[PDB]
Amino acid sequence: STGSATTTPIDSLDDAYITPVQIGTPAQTLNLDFDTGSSDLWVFSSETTASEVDGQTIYTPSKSTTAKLLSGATWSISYGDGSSSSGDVYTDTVSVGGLTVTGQAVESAKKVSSSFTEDSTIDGLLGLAFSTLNTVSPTQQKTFFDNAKASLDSPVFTADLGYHAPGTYNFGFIDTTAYTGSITYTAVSTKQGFWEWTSTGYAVGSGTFKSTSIDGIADTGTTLLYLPATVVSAYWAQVSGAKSSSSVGGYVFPCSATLPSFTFGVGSARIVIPGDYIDFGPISTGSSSCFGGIQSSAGIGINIFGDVALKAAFVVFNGATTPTLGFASK
Numbered sequence: 001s002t003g004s005a006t007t008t009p010i011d012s013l014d015d016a017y018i019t020p021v022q023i024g025t026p027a028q029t030l031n032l033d034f035d036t037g038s039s040d041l042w043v044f045s046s047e048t049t050a051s052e053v054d055g056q057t058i059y060t061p062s063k064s065t066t067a068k069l070l071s072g073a074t075w076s077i078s079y080g081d082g083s084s085s086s087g088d089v090y091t092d093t094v095s096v097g098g099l100t101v102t103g104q105a106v107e108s109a110k111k112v113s114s115s116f117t118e119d120s121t122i123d124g125l126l127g128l129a130f131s132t133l134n135t136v137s138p139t140q141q142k143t144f145f146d147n148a149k150a151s152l153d154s155p156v157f158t159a160d161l162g163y164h165a166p167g168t169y170n171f172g173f174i175d176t177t178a179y180t181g182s183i184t185y186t187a188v189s190t191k192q193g194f195w196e197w198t199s200t201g202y203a204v205g206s207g208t209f210k211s212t213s214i215d216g217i218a219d220t221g222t223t224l225l226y227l228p229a230t231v232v233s234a235y236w237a238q239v240s241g242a243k244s245s246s247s248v249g250g251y252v253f254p255c256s257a258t259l260p261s262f263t264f265g266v267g268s269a270r271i272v273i274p275g276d277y278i279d280f281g282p283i284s285t286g287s288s289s290c291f292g293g294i295q296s297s298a299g300i301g302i303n304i305f306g307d308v309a310l311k312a313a314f315v316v317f318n319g320a321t322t323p324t325l326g327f328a329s330k
């Protein structure tokens with residue numbers, strides 16, 4: 001079997017991507033944030049605190065003839081940005097563009113933090129990292145990918161995020177028309193539960209490539225590219241007027257600048273992120289100071305190849321016996 005769904009940026013800056021997911025019987029379509037950095041499938045629901053719901057579409061388990069309460073199961077999750085959610089668990093039918101999973105754990109939110117409330121376009125998340133990070137207690141649950149894997153034509157899923165454009169999440173196959181050249185595969189460590197790999201280096205604009213090992217995770221759930229301080233300092237040094245701002249919370253640059261590109265290594269292969277992908281618009285409405293898309297990972301504890309980097313490439317999350325990552329230019 002295979003699945004294919006269109007993923008769409010939530011706004012003009014590509015702050016996040018939403019993909020419609022069908023839940024329950026009859027189908028309840030919720031727009032979820034597919035996150036290769038987490039492992040909980042959670043949704044806004046009929047159980048979410050009224051004041052915490054502001055425009056999102058909710059899942060009503062009582063109206064699904066296939067929804068079953070998972071006795072005594074609860075979940076609670078905290079994310080890198082300080083956001084969080086928690087609640088109870090149902091098992092229900094979940095389909096992503098023609099690919100169906102019966103008995104998939106759907107975590108119904110009883111509480112969501114202010115950032116989820118404020119984001120009316122995101123109805124919940126669909127975790128695509130390794131099931132070892134799933135928060136369901138006392139019995140840990142599996143991800144949508146983990147449950148569908150045995151059935152897929154190939155044990156893979158692909159991310160093809162667009163820059164100010166629609167894109168695709170494919171399950172079970174590799175669309176050879178969606179990329180140029182070849183897919184270069186690289187080793188994955190699942191010890192932290194993430195799609196963790198090692199980049200062979202970087203280049204800033206037309207500058208010389210620095211061969212250096214950068215350990216990080218392929219994370220579609222993180223908007224920006226988070227790299228070591230030395231690397232990020234080398235990038236922003238090429239932009240006139242760029243500076244690290246403690247009040248804003250990162251590197252800022254004059255909105256009138258034309259940003260240099262950023263290249264990262266995948267083995268001998270190179271993925272080029274055009275400069276425009278690194279522009280995250282005014283720091284505050286009407287300001288001429290803009291927020292950078294490449295930020296330091298010094299406060300995080302891990303380098304993050306988020307949407308900024310991934311949207312420059314066709315990405316294969318290969319769930320074979322020994323999992324690996326594939327990257328191609330497109």
Ligand SMILES: Nc1ccc(F)cn1
Pocket residue numbers: 035037038079080081083125221222223
């Ligand atoms: N890095 C993040 C932050 C929030 C979220 F829901 C997922 N990933």
